Structures are given as structure tokens and as C-alpha cells.
Design a protein around this ligand. Structure first.
Ligand code: HN9
Ligand code: ZN
Ligand code: ZN
Ligand code: ZN
Length: 231
């Protein structure tokens, strides 16, 4: 069973194997009195690991590295942050001090610097235009267009048919929008459409928060976004 927020003390990290050589990591963080679960991804690349997104803070990200060594035992050599918010880049300095090469799009690096969030060291080129895709080792990176944020990327694992949608995709159990201060409401459903059209073969779909599912998370997200648009 997939872990939920009441099962994870803030400061601890769970791993959940999705497929051969593909895990999610789950952590929790408090914000404005409430506690929120958050996902990232781990993809085996030969005898090293590619990390997708931090565990939302320095403390959680150190625990993330320790759980990975405990349960997997392979080195995390590169990390990709899928947008500039703290649940994606919070902990980047911990990754760098551990010798992880940290990556993000120029768009994400630029926004992180303006917000005051931690800044991934390396730039991911070739992703500035909606529909752009580039290979990054064992995954494909895809920029669907602005949605939850103007810079959000999605990540696809072709060997396992795992689509990591990040925060542009909502879990089915989430029926209201949430933190859309930085969203492009007008373009969000169009960007989701681009994800559908580019990865129709996806078997598993991982949201940035909550329970994985299939491609029906995409239509669900469109519904929730349109309802918030019509407030
Ligand atoms: O929406 C987001 O992307 C986000 N990032 C940090 C906090 N949130 C809001 C949230 C709301 C409900 C949840 O189950 C989980 C998260
Ligand atoms: Zn976000
Ligand atoms: Zn988020
Ligand atoms: Zn729904």
C-alpha cells in the first residue's frame, strides 16, 4: 500500500517501488499548520541512480539519501528538479554537498533565484518551448507548457512506462486546486493535453503529491483545474 501523510513523521522518507528499477520517494512537510505529503522519483541508471526532485527540505533530503543507501545501496549521481518550488529544489544544497550533480531548466533556475529558493547547478538545454523533449539517461524530459507553474517539466521512464507528471498532475483524491499562485490557469488544460498526446502508452502516472494511478489522472486534473478557473 502506498504511504500517506499520517504514516510518515516529518523528517522521515519512504520509498515505494513502482517497477523494475523505478521507485517513488515520499516525504512530509508542515506548511501553515497543516502537513502535506510529497513525491519524487528514483530511476536506476546502470549502477548509479538518477534522482527526480528533492524531498522538500534539507532535513528530508538528507533522510532521503540515507533511505536510498539503506534500501537500494547505489550512488545518486544526478538529480533533476521539475520546477522551482521548495518541494522540488528544497534540499539541493544537501544533494550537492553529497556530490550529486544537480540539474534544472534555465527557466527553473531563473525562477528559483527570484523566489530565493535553492538553485540547481546545471542547466537542462532544449526544453524552453512547449512540446520540447530531450533524453537524460534512463528518462525522457518533456516540457508540456505552463500549468502548475510556467517551468514545470514531466519525466518519462520508457523502459518501465512510468510517467512522472509532477505537480502539473493531481491525484484522483484531490478535488480542489491548492497552491496555484504560480500557475497558468488558461494554459494548464492545453499543457495536460500535450502530455496525453506525447505519452499515450504510459502504464503508471505519478503525481507530485499523493497516490499514483494511470492516465485517468490527466482528465481528472483538467476537471479540477477548470472548476477552479470558474470560481
Ligand atoms: O499543490 C502543490 O503542488 C503543493 N506543493 C506543496 C503544497 N502543495 C499543496 C498541496 C495540497 C494538497 C496535497 O495533498 C499536497 C499538496
Ligand atoms: Zn509547485
Ligand atoms: Zn507541490
Ligand atoms: Zn476527478
Amino acid at each position: 500500500e502506498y504511504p500517506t501523510v499520517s504514516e510518515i513523521p516529518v523528517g522521515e522518507v519512504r520509498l515505494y517501488q513502482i517497477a523494475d528499477g523505478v521507485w517513488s520517494h515520499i516525504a512530509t512537510q508542515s506548511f501553515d499548520g497543516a502537513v502535506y505529503p510529497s513525491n519524487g522519483l528514483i530511476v536506476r541508471d546502470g549502477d548509479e541512480l538518477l534522482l527526480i526532485d528533492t524531498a522538500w527540505g534539507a532535513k528530508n533530503t538528507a533522510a532521503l539519501l540515507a533511505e536510498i543507501e539503506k534500501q537500494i545501496g547505489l550512488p545518486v549521481t544526478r538529480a533533476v528538479s521539475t520546477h522551482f518550488h521548495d518541494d522540488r529544489v528544497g534540499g539541493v544544497d544537501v544533494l550537492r554537498a553529497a556530490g550529486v550533480a544537480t540539474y534544472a531548466s534555465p527557466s527553473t533556475r531563473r525562477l528559483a533565484e527570484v523566489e530565493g529558493n535553492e538553485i540547481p547547478t546545471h542547466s537542462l538545454e532544449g526544453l524552453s518551448s512547449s512540446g520540447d523533449a530531450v533524453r537524460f539517461g534512463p528518462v525522457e524530459l518533456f516540457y508540456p507548457g505552463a500549468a502548475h507553474s510556467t517551468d514545470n517539466l514531466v519525466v518519462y521512464v520508457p523502459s518501465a512506462s512510468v510517467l512522472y507528471g509532477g505537480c502539473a498532475i493531481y491525484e484522483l483524491s484531490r478535488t480542489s486546486a491548492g497552491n496555484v499562485a504560480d500557475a497558468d490557469l488558461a494554459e494548464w488544460p492545453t499543457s495536460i493535453e500535450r502530455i496525453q498526446q506525447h505519452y499515450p502508452e504510459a502504464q503508471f502516472v505519478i503525481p507530485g503529491h499523493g497516490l499514483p494511478g494511470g492516465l485517468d489522472l490527466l482528465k481528472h486534473t483538467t476537471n479540477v483545474v477548470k472548476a477552479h478557473t470558474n470560481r
